[PDB]
Amino acid sequence: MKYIQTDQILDIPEGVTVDIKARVVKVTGPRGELTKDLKHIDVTFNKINNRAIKITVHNGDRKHVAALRTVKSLIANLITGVTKGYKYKMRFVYAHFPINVNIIKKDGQDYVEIRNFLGEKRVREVKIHEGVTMEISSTQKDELIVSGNSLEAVSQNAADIQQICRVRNKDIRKFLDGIYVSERGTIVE
Amino acid sequence: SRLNEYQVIGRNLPTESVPEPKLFRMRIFAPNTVVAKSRYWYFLQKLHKVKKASGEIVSVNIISEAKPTKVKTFGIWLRYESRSGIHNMYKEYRDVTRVGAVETMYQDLAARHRARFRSIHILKVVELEKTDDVKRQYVKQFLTKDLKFPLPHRVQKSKKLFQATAPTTFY
Amino acid sequence: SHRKYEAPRHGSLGFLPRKRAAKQRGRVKSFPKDVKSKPVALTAFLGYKAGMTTIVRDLDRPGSKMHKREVVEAATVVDTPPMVVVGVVGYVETPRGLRSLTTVWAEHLSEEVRRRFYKNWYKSKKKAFTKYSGKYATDAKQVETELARIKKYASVVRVLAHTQIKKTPLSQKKAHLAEIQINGGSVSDKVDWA
Amino acid sequence: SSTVKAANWRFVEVGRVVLVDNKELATIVEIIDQKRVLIDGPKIQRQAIALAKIVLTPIVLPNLPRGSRTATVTKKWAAADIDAKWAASGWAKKLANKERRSQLSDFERFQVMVLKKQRRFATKKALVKA
Amino acid sequence: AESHRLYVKGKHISYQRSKSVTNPNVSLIQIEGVASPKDAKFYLGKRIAYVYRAPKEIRGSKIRVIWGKVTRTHGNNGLVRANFKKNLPPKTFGASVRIMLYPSNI
Amino acid sequence: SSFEKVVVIDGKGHLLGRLASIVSKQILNGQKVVVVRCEELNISGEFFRNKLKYHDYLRKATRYNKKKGPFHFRAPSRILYKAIRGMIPHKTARGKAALERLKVFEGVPPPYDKKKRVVVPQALRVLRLKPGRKYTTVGKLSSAVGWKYESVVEKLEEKRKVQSAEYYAKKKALTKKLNAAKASTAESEAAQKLAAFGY
RNA sequence: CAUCGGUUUGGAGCGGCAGGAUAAUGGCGGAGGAAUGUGGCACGGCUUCUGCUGUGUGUUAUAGCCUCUGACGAUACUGCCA
RNA sequence: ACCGAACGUGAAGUUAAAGUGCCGGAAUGCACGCUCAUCAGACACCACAAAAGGUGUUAGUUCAUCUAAAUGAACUAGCCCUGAAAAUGGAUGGCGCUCA
RNA sequence: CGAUGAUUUUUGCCCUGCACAUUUUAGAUGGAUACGAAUAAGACUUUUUAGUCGCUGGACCAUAGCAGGCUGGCAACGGUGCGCUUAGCGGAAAGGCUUUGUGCGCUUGCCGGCGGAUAGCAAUGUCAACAUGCGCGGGGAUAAAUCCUUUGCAUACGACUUAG
Numbered sequence A: 001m002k003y004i005q006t007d008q009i010l011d012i013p014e015g016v017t018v019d020i021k022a023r024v025v026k027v028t029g030p031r032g033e034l035t036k037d038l039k040h041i042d043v044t045f046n047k048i049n050n051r052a053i054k055i056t057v058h059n060g061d062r063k064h065v066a067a068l069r070t071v072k073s074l075i076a077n078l079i080t081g082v083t084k085g086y087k088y089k090m091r092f093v094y095a096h097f098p099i100n101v102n103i104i105k106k107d108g109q110d111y112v113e114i115r116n117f118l119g120e121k122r123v124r125e126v127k128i129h130e131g132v133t134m135e136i137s138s139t140q141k142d143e144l145i146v147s148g149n150s151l152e153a154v155s156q157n158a159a160d161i162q163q164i165c166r167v168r169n170k171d172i173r174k175f176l177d178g179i180y181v182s183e184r185g186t187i188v189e
Numbered sequence B: 001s002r003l004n005e006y007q008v009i010g011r012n013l014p015t016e017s018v019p020e021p022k023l024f025r026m027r028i029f030a031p032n033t034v035v036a037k038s039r040y041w042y043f044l045q046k047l048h049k050v051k052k053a054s055g056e057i058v059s060v061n062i063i064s065e066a067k068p069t070k071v072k073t074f075g076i077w078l079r080y081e082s083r084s085g086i087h088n089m090y091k092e093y094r095d096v097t098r099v100g101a102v103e104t105m106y107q108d109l110a111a112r113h114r115a116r117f118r119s120i121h122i123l124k125v126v127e128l129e130k131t132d133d134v135k136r137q138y139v140k141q142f143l144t145k146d147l148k149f150p151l152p153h154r155v156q157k158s159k160k161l162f163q164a165t166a167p168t169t170f171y
Numbered sequence C: 001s002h003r004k005y006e007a008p009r010h011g012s013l014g015f016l017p018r019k020r021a022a023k024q025r026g027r028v029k030s031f032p033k034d035v036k037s038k039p040v041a042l043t044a045f046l047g048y049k050a051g052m053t054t055i056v057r058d059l060d061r062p063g064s065k066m067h068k069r070e071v072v073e074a075a076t077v078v079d080t081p082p083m084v085v086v087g088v089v090g091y092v093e094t095p096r097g098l099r100s101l102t103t104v105w106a107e108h109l110s111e112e113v114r115r116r117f118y119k120n121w122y123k124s125k126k127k128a129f130t131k132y133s134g135k136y137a138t139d140a141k142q143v144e145t146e147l148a149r150i151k152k153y154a155s156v157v158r159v160l161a162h163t164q165i166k167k168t169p170l171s172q173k174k175a176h177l178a179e180i181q182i183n184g185g186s187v188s189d190k191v192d193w194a
Numbered sequence D: 001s002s003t004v005k006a007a008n009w010r011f012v013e014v015g016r017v018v019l020v021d022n023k024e025l026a027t028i029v030e031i032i033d034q035k036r037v038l039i040d041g042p043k044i045q046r047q048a049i050a051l052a053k054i055v056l057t058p059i060v061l062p063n064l065p066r067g068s069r070t071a072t073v074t075k076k077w078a079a080a081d082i083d084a085k086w087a088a089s090g091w092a093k094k095l096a097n098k099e100r101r102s103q104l105s106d107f108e109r110f111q112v113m114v115l116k117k118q119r120r121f122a123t124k125k126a127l128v129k130a
Numbered sequence E: 001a002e003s004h005r006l007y008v009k010g011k012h013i014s015y016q017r018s019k020s021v022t023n024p025n026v027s028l029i030q031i032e033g034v035a036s037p038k039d040a041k042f043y044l045g046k047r048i049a050y051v052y053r054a055p056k057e058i059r060g061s062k063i064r065v066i067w068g069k070v071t072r073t074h075g076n077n078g079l080v081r082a083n084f085k086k087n088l089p090p091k092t093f094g095a096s097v098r099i100m101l102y103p104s105n106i
Numbered sequence F: 001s002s003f004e005k006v007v008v009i010d011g012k013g014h015l016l017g018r019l020a021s022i023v024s025k026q027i028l029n030g031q032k033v034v035v036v037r038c039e040e041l042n043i044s045g046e047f048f049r050n051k052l053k054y055h056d057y058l059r060k061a062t063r064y065n066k067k068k069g070p071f072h073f074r075a076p077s078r079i080l081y082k083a084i085r086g087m088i089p090h091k092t093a094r095g096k097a098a099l100e101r102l103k104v105f106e107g108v109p110p111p112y113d114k115k116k117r118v119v120v121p122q123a124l125r126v127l128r129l130k131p132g133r134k135y136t137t138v139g140k141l142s143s144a145v146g147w148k149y150e151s152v153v154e155k156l157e158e159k160r161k162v163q164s165a166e167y168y169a170k171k172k173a174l175t176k177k178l179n180a181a182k183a184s185t186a187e188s189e190a191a192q193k194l195a196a197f198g199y
Numbered sequence G: 001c002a003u004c005g006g007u008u009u010g011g012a013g014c015g016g017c018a019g020g021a022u023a024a025u026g027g028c029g030g031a032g033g034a035a036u037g038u039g040g041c042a043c044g045g046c047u048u049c050u051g052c053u054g055u056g057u058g059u060u061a062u063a064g065c066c067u068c069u070g071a072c073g074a075u076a077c078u079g080c081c082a
Numbered sequence H: 001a002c003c004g005a006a007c008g009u010g011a012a013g014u015u016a017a018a019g020u021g022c023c024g025g026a027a028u029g030c031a032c033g034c035u036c037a038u039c040a041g042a043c044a045c046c047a048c049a050a051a052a053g054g055u056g057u058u059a060g061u062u063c064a065u066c067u068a069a070a071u072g073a074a075c076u077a078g079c080c081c082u083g084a085a086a087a088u089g090g091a092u093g094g095c096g097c098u099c100a
Numbered sequence I: 001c002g003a004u005g006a007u008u009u010u011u012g013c014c015c016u017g018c019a020c021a022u023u024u025u026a027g028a029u030g031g032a033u034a035c036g037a038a039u040a041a042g043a044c045u046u047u048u049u050a051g052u053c054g055c056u057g058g059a060c061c062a063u064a065g066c067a068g069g070c071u072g073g074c075a076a077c078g079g080u081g082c083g084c085u086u087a088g089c090g091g092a093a094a095g096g097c098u099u100u101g102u103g104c105g106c107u108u109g110c111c112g113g114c115g116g117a118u119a120g121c122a123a124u125g126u127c128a129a130c131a132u133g134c135g136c137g138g139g140g141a142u143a144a145a146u147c148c149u150u151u152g153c154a155u156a157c158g159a160c161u162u163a164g
């Protein structure tokens, strides 16, 4: 409808410094550094003070304005991943065949190896994204821990694990086997 | 420049029974006086049972804007015909003259409703004196405190086909 | 109307036109992809088809009915006397494809490979490569500069080799000359090896 | 610190000085909508104009109320010395220099050529001694 | 000096034409530096020479000339209509012509 | 708007059809045109859509003999050439002469690497398209339909840009030196007299 | 090349006159009003009030605006100039 | 066979219908909006599309709950999307065009 | 489209200097004047706070002299044209961008002396790049292909693979 101005406020906490130039966003915190490129969006940024940043769209229509909240949420995930971390938990679900999951290394590169899924002889390997750590949890039986600074990478790599274990040619309501994301939270609470 | 506002005054031709027929006035938005009188007769023939042949135009006069350099918000009430029926609607415009707002309304109903000039009756054009009389947000957002806004992505219009310097859009 | 019954096409559309080949020597359309870490080595060789014979062999394929049993197989014999390296060609990458920059030849060429540059050898003065051999005599600095060019600019290096057809029972005296791409190492290693 | 780089856009707002027809100055008095404003100045006619027909300048008339009439705008304009601020800007100097150049006769252009010859002689002498 | 030009550069663009029929008697000429009908009106009535080279010498010269004159403007982009003593041959579409400064009114 | 001996256009960021129409009219009027960096040309619309359009183009071929059919060139400069030829009466001798005045290239080959390149504002994408619209880079489209030399052109363009940056650094150093020399000889009698004349 | 006659296309053309709400405006003088409320004052989060700042009250004050009107003076628009 | 206009042989001027990004003479002319389509659309006769759907977007109508900071329901009609399947490769005339 | 070998003992061929004369031209008539990238961005200075620039190339460079003659002085020791020389860089289609000394010229940076008429009041009023040929001059090199006979890895005939 061509709204004259739309604003969003980024709350940037005590231990972070969000550096922005030409829609390239670099968020430094106690757990490291995260970068995001936003050259595909027409937005502008204002430093209100050290603890707040204003994000603005001028003369935007409905969809251009819809992108504004998305921009703010993405940068906020950057901040909360550089200060609090991100941790996704996966549980192994099976009826008869135990799912054997190991973190192996080939070509000097880390992989997640899933064996005996529904008794299949095929072995499944999922490449581990950069900055994402996998860890077989010890407190809980049959649980995988996916952690990292980037919410996007951690969630995508957990989804890669969940999608590789789809059941074919069966009633999935009955054959409920798989590896599913059970908890989505933060490393430090 | 497309339109002017006219008053058109007319009556029935005097007869022995009615020597002093009533005078009727209309406010007509027209390109010229020929169209103005035509619109007057069109509306008088729809409202009252009077034809052009038994009446006469008494007066045609330009009505100029009182304050042509004062920014105003206008409310306009309309009856228009769509492809499928007849509808009433009310819209708001910002301009410095009534004729400017009416020209914008004609463009706007052409653009959004495919409503040609022949399909629109202007019920009433009113200058909205108070900010509370302004109802539509697409005009209400220009009535706020300390209004300011940039004009990003300026495209400069060149007089030559080939430019020896890289394009810029700053402003 | 449709064919009354379905049948596959006769013959392959991928070997068209069914014309005579432009040359009798089959040319290598594509060479193996170059791996830098490997040792410098040739990728092709030229020989002569001599005939076919029969062999007997023990088969090693577990799960086959003929596992650890003798099979009789047809085989082909290719007469392959050694080839002689007589030159080197450097190729540069261009937006229009590979382009040969320069070619450097050896000082001495045998009669059989120099017979390749003639249609009437016995009526000729045999002048082929007679002024080129002088480019070595003084100090071979022109040869060194051309090879330095190949090292500086070429991305693909191929060697020029010819067969020794006089070691075959063939009555033909012309040797077959071909380019064989050099794979492995750097371009400098390739030029040195050539 | 966070160090974000902000835009340096010129804003459409009351008091912003504009050029009209590349020749004459004016100031924004009111905003009509996204496309149109009311402008006024001592050397123009108060009018409603499209923003696309005028060019914003980096100069803002300070403390000009919205909807000011012609007398108010002229008084504020004279008090703020907007003409002086504009005439000192390199933009106005370039316009004035182009106008000056376009008035030269053939004989004056000849004089420019000979003066530039002398100028170049001096500049090259300076260049070698550098 | 290095330059000796006393004419304005031009090009033979086209004939007067509709979509399908051409009129060789009128040539459309593009004057260099002229981009509006306002600026083109300076050149109305000025003489135009098309100068070309021919194989056979006439009075010892191989250079031949076809003379014309600017008659009116054409369109909105500063082109002009020209009238030559002999119609310019169509092979000269895209060739250079010379717009003289005379008859002068400066 | 002057008549030039050659006009060399940097094709980067230009919209295909608008540049094509401008260049067609230029060459038809006797102007020689060179367009470089055709791999950097733009087409409006998302990449997938223009890929579908090129595949619709590919589908057209002479049924009785494919070798007589339309020939689908994949290189970006040939895509621009196809756009330009469709705007030329190319079956006339005058049209062939006009097309002989045009040259199109991937990258910036010599001798045009050391010549001035210009832009065409009426065809420039950043000036023409509304800011939110999607567009295609012709180099990416060409690779997706069979152009084989994207990486070669990219490498050679990197090398050219290194050399050009060195050139520009030297030019900038000399320009600064000359500017200092001009400022030193300022407040001179000739300089003041020139300033009175607008120069 | 000059001047004339016939036809015709132009110029940032220049000037005189008439009409209209004897334009409407604007400018000046006077009366009345209000808020997207200026100064002032009272309360606040960030300011060593370093456009800081928001909410209130109220009516020209350390900015202004709107309506009506009184005497002048122009301009646009349309038309005429033998 | 429609629109315009009816015809001796010429010069100059002006037009009708139709047009002015290139092919093609004439503007990438000035302006307000709408539309983004993984079968967009593009001009009378004329070279077709329906019933019916969409929380794509836009503008409107009528009710309702709201400070005891806006929101909810039904609906109208613009463009867009679905409904929309044929045989040689191919047609807004072609190129191509997306604040067109 | 590229690389590479050999290119006539004929008075034929190649390279090169000059001079003269011809033919051709899709169309010279001061100069195609070289960063890259972004565009809701670039650059400069302090300092990341802010100030400034652009808002078109109507720019930059070149531009005075019988189409640019003949002569003389002053100021600076600069600018510039042609011919030699050194060194480096450039392979995307490099064939160009440079740099070192050297010889002869010009210099409008400033001031002088002489010359142009009559082409008659305009007439392109003839000044370019490309190529070729002809006289002289200086360097340099000294082939093959086809027919024919032969072969059969080929073949209707041409063609092809061979040998002489």
Ligand SMILES: CN[C@@H]1[C@@H](O)[C@@H](O[C@@H]2[C@@H](O)[C@H](O[C@H]3O[C@H]([C@@H](C)O)[C@@H](O)[C@H](O)[C@H]3N)[C@@H](N)C[C@H]2N)OC[C@]1(C)O
Pocket (backbone or CB within 6 Å): H039, H084
């Ligand atoms: C306003 N009246 C519209 C009329 O304009 C037209 O609408 C078309 C619509 O039918 C087209 O859409 C239709 O036709 C296209 C194709 C055949 O063009 C199909 O791809 C599409 O599936 C089909 N729904 C749509 N793409 C454009 C509208 N203007 O069709 C009739 C109508 C819907 O009444």
